[PDB]
Amino acid sequence: MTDALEQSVLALEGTVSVLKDSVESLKCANEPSTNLASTMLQTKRVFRLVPEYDV
């Protein structure tokens, strides 16, 4: 009974802690790559090329 609730609390605490660590790692990894993607890998396809043959 009550011991089982304690086991549930402990397991859930473990899940919360590992998710905390995972989220921190994800943010730390993403932020530099986030900058990389955001600043100067952005492009715009203004045109598309077409042979004069079909026109």
Partner: protein, 39 residues
């Protein structure tokens, strides 16, 4: 597609010309169509 336009004889421009302006071969000329949704 320009590879089909010019027969084998047209490639002989410059020094390769068979000496017993000439519209030297170029790839099929492209028109650039705007696609960004503006004019």
């Amino acid at each position: 597609l320009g590879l089909l336009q010019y027969a084998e004889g047209d490639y002989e421009i410059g020094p390769w010309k068979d000496s017993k302006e000439d519209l030297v071969p170029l790839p099929e000329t492209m028109v650039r169509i705007r696609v960004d949704g503006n004019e």
